[PDB]
Amino acid sequence: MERAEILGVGTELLYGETLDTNTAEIARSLKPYALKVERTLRVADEVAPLAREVEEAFARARLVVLSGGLGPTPDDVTREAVALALGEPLELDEAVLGEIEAFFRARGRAMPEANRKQAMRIPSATWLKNPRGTAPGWWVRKGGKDLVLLPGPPPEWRPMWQEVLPRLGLPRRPYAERVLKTWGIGESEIVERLGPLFVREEEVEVGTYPKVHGVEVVVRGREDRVAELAERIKKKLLKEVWGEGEMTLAEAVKRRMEREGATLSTMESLTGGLLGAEITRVPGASRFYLGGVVSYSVGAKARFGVPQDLLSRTVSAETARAMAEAARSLFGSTYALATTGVAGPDPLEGEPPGTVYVALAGPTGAEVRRYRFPGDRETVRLRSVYAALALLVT
Amino acid sequence: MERAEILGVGTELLYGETLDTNTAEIARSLKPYALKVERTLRVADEVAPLAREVEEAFARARLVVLSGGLGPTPDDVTREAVALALGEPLELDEAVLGEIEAFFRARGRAMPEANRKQAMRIPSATWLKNPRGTAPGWWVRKGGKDLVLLPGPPPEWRPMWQEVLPRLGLPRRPYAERVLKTWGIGESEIVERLGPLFVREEEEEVGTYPKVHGVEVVVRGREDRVAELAERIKKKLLKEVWGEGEMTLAEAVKRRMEREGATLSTMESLTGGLLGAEITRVPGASRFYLGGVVSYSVGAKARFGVPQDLLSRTVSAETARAMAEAARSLFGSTYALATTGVAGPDPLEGEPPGTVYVALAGPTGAEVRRYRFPGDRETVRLRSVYAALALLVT
């Protein structure tokens, strides 16, 4: 079985100033392919060391993938290094140069000269287009082998990689992942409900992963086994599974709103906007989402419809219902969501961090759910948002 | 300057099934020492591969630190591999085997037969006591070179490493690092601006790291050189620097509001709440942030005071200004921020994804800034949030 080598370029990665997720993500994406990954490197932004790593990786591998160091600064050296490692000169490509000048002209700026080095390639490199920045990628095919250069930021390289991967002509293996997402049920109760279906072999395995949007049950391994097995697991978890694969809670809400021809608004205290943020993450949200109020002070809550009588008692079911009713009547939406309670670090009104009420107000009346969430400030905020969305999809 | 290599061992670190923070925490602890860390590695639990990597590492390094693979399973193989790499045999240490039997008797159990291997050591190795788990570590001195084996889990290895590290006799140098956080200046421009101050020598180095919150400029190396080059660099870039070190934009905004005794509110369209969300990330936001609105429909935009004549050009500096001044009057706040623009993926009002206006209104007037962000929907939304916060800290 042939080897893939994966190097993430960046001095900041050595020290975790940025945590290297790229090498693991790229390794995860290679699972459907018969290549072995024996190691992954993080390498400093330095030519001679980087060139040596590349020279070695290339000699042993069917595929070498790199990330990072495709920028314009003296710390961007991946191209020089790869050129050194493969013993080819850098040549300026005038057409890509022009694409870079146009990118800057479009912003009413002059292209700084430094950028020229991004238009630079070796004779065996093909370009990988990067519409999301100035740093295009490389794809070198040489002696049966592939070497791909990718930009550091994920928002840049993910699409680039998606595009080039199938074309590499790597040998396939019938590997699958199925991710089933649940809400309102802990890991143990899941393992219990599954019983024997909770298998863990060389062929197929099943895991629980706790996440802020509920516990995921991940089935992986051989395609056919993942298929039969996940089918039975969804079966036995029919009540708690809200979605699969790339389905999110915000997207299940969008599909319910468009089915019903219904609208939504929000009123938020502890979440500070995050619940609006999360509804609007999904493209097409303006088809149903009218807007929201972040009522972060006592003046804001009164102004936008929460009774006076309730302003000194914000950690309460009564408050979360009043906020959801306030937003629904202000905006005129079919449905309205509200989040109130204690994020952390400090307790509030004699209640501890993680004490949260989420409310849904709709045509037939309001509902409130009390939660007691584990985690720090930002984790409690996150789980609150998902619990608010869950009032609509579970 | 001599090399330090750092290897994390475990197949699950390659795939990020477990997140490798060990190699980075080790690299950081090595800072006060005149060693160059050129790379960090993660390696599969496989004896022949790991051996070759230890061998290559040991050949080129003054220090080699391995993490993990010290358990009892057929997949814990670090000892064998070190053994093999250094051409020395594994020996049972009866005393350490005794300590391992005491560990299991303490829990009322017999030691399983697998745990035998945890007492193997090579002749060149002294023992490193693990008083929090079963596997002790090794310190190997040979050829004027050190090689340390450490357990995987951090509560085990951290006290072990902290103990052995000052004994290794590594050469010391006074280290510093300064982290300058800027907004509103591109990476190419930072280079040009800084000119000959963008040093990359052995003693001293200056690096740029793009983030969604702004380009970070990092100086690291010899202490006297770092303070000098950071103060001149900060002088060149004085307008664009909003924070140092751990500072986030939300925190800087917080510092300015408290400093002046001032309040803030927001009005958001394309960001959807993510501005309020980022502001309220920081404990004690309630002391200055009164709240905000998310004006995501045309009706909400009118309800909350975008002028009617602007409803068909929401993508404009005119509308941003008016959103800001409305939010201000609506909450009675000293200042207010607004965002408006095209998130993507679709154009709006004839303008392409990435076209964004942010605005700040205050007691002496308002100001607007326009951007053309190149990335996907989620990146545009996040760059916008930081673009707005930057208006208060320039």
Ligand SMILES: Nc1ncnc2c1ncn2[C@@H]1O[C@H](COP(=O)(O)OP(=O)(O)OP(=O)(O)O)[C@@H](O)[C@H]1O
């Ligand atoms: N391996 C990685 N894992 C996660 N994030 C990364 C990784 N590499 C880089 N990043 C993020 O992306 C930025 C990219 O840095 P780098 O300067 O290497 O990219 P580049 O290839 O030069 O491309 P660009 O000029 O497009 O940023 C880093 O500051 C970091 O925030």
Ligand SMILES: Nc1ncnc2c1ncn2[C@@H]1O[C@H](COP(=O)(O)OP(=O)(O)OP(=O)(O)O)[C@@H](O)[C@H]1O
């Ligand atoms: N590189 C790493 N970075 C951060 N955490 C790690 C790393 N490696 C391991 N861990 C943590 O500790 C565990 C490591 O298990 P591993 O088998 O590597 O340890 P070991 O040295 O064999 O000793 P033990 O038998 O006590 O696990 C992981 O499951 C994870 O919690």
Ligand SMILES: [Mg+2]
């Ligand atoms: Mg770069």
Ligand code: NA
């Ligand atoms: Na920040």
Ligand code: NA
């Ligand atoms: Na807002």
